[PDB]
Design a protein around this nucleic acid. Structure first.
Length: 67
DNA sequence: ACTGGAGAAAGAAAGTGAAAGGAAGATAAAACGGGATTCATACACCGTTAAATACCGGTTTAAAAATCCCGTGGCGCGTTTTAAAAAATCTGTGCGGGTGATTTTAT
């Protein structure tokens, strides 16, 4: 991410990407990992969430064929 | 001539691999101290007796005990410090289903 941490050198103006996308698996463990990542992002880097640099992807789970 | 982009030089600040050495550990050789045997030899217990000591009666006298006056330092009180012990609060960890990953050899 290249922003630092610890609020002593944590500068939110050095973010190397203006769009961060979370893309895990489509089952429940993906949901658990998503919750863990959201907890980390909210507790450690509030400004990134406030400015709107976090997104969520939605991959499919099933594929159906008939002919 | 002038402008602005771009590539190359040059210079300074940060990360790096290697460094005696020394306190901090670690590991062996040595000196020590505490049990099992083995007796010869000195020690414990029993009769006999001369002698050394305990005891009583009455002095005494010099020394120690008893008594009075006083002037202090050594205990007692109140109030603070300061370690020491106790109660309270954090830190790891393993049990069993789940998610995802690493390494060395032969031909």
């Amino acid at each position: 991410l290249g922003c630092g941490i610890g609020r002593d050198e944590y500068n939110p103006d050095k973010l190397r990407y203006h769009s961060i996308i979370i893309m895990t698996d489509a089952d429940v463990d993906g949901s658990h990992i998503r919750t863990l990542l959201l907890t980390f992002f909210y507790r450690q880097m509030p400004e990134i969430v406030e400015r709107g640099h976090v997104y969520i992807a939605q991959p499919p789970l099933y594929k159906v064929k008939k002919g």
